[PDB]
Amino acid sequence: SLECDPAVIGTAVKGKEAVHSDLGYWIESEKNDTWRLKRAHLIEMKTCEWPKSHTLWTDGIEESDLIIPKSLAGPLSHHNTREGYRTQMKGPWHSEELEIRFEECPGTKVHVEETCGTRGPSLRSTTASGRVIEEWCCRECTMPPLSFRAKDGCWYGMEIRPRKEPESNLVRSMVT
Amino acid sequence: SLECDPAVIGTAVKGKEAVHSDLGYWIESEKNDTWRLKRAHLIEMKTCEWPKSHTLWTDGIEESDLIIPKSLAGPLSHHNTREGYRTQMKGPWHSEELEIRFEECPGTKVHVEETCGTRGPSLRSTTASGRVIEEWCCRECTMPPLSFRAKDGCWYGMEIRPRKEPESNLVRSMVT
C-alpha cells in the first residue's frame, strides 16, 4: 500500500545499459565492468517504496549500499549501487530538480586520503559567500566522485570531505 | 561463466506487462492481481543461467515454483511463475519451436478433480495413432490450463493428467 504506483513505472535492460524510470525518476545503470549506478535525474522527490516487481536484481542487497535511499523511493537493486559509497541519507534532497552523476564539480578536486574525514552531511562546493572550494578528500570512495547537480550549485557525496577547510563555513543539507 | 550472454538480453516492464527476452527466448508476464507467466515462445533451448542483473523481482522465490526450469535458462523471477503449477522439469523440451500458453488444446477440456493422477512426464494430446484425448484432469492446478504448442501438436503440463487412458497409448516426453 506504500508502494509507488506501478502504472507509470518503466524499467528496462538491453546489454550493458539499464534504466529505472518513473514520472520524475530516471535512474541509469551501466555494466563497467560490473553493474553500478551511472547517473540519475529526479524532479519530484517522493516517499513511496519502489515495487520489487518493477525492479531488477533484487537479491542480497543491504539498504546501506543503496545510493538512492529506499525511503526516497530508491529502487532496491544492485543497479542502485556504486563501490565505495553508501546510502545518501543526508543529501541535498530539499531541492526540486536533482541530478546524481559521477563527475568532479567545476574547479574542484577529490583525493583518496585515508587521513581524511569520515562520511557526514553533504556539502555544497560553494561557500555561503559564493566562492569555490578547490580541494576535497575521500577516505574509501572511488573515482569519479559522486556529485549532486542542483539549482544552487554542485553538492558532493558524504564520503567526500574538504581538505584544510573549516566545515563550519560551508552549506550543509539538513534532511535525512 | 555459466550465465547466458547478457549482450543480447532485453528485459522491460511498463505497468502490467513485462517481457524477459533474448535471442531465442521471449517470455511475457502479466499483472492480474498477482504477477504470473502470461505466455512464452522459445526457439532455441539453452543450458546457461539467466543473469540476475537482467531479471525482475528475483527476491524470495523457490526454484520449485519457476515454470521454466533454471537449468533451461529460465529467469529466476516471480514473473516466471503460475498458480497451481511447479517447475516443468519433464517437458517437451526436445522440440525446436515451443510456445507456452494457458489454454485448452483444441479437442480437449480440463477439470479440477482432486481425485486425479499425480505429476508425471508431459503428455501429448494426440495418441501415437493420432486420435485426440478429450478428457484430462487436474488436482491442484488452476485454469486456463498450462499447455505446450509444438510442431507435432499440443502438449499438456505435468499437473494435467488423463482420466481414461492406460498410460501406454500416450506420448511421453523423456527429457529433464
Author numbering:
A (entry chain A), B (entry chain B): 176 to 351
Give the exact sentences the study uses for this entry:
The flavivirus NS1 is a ~48 kDa conserved non-structural protein with two conserved N-linked glycosylation sites and six intra-molecular disulfide bonds. NS1 consists of the N-terminal β-roll, the middle wing, and the C-terminal β-ladder domains. Two NS1s are assembled into a symmetric, head-to-head dimer through domain swapping of the β-rolls and the extension of β-sheets from the β-ladders. Although not being a component of the virion, NS1 represents a marker for host immune recognition and evasion.
To understand the function of ZIKV NS1, we solved the crystal structure of ZIKV NS1172–352 from ZIKV strain Suriname (KU312312). The crystal of ZIKV NS1 β-ladder domain (NS1172–352) diffracted to a 2.8 Å resolution in Fourier space. Two β-ladder protomers were found in each asymmetric unit. These two protomers form a symmetric, head-to-head dimer through an extended, 14-stranded β-sheet seen in the dimeric assembly of DENV and WNV NS1 β-ladder structures. The dimer interface buries a total surface area of 1628 Å2. In ZIKV NS1, K227 forms a salt bridge with D234, while H253 interacts with W232 through a π-π stacking interaction at physiological pH. Remarkably, T233A, one of the mutations found in the Natal_RGN strain (KU527068), which was isolated from fetal brain tissue with severe microcephaly, is located at the NS1 dimer interface. The hydroxyl group of T233 is central in organizing a hydrogen-bonding network across the dimer interface. In particular, it has been shown that T233 also plays a pivotal role in organizing a hydrogen-bonding network across the dimer interface in other solved ZIKV NS1 structures. These structural data suggests that mutation of Thr233 to Ala would disrupt this elaborated network, and could potentially impair the stability of the dimer. Over 49% of T233A mutant are in the monomeric state. This percentile is much higher than that of the parent Suriname NS1 β-ladder domain, suggesting that T233A mutation interferes the self-association of ZIKV NS1 β-ladder domain.
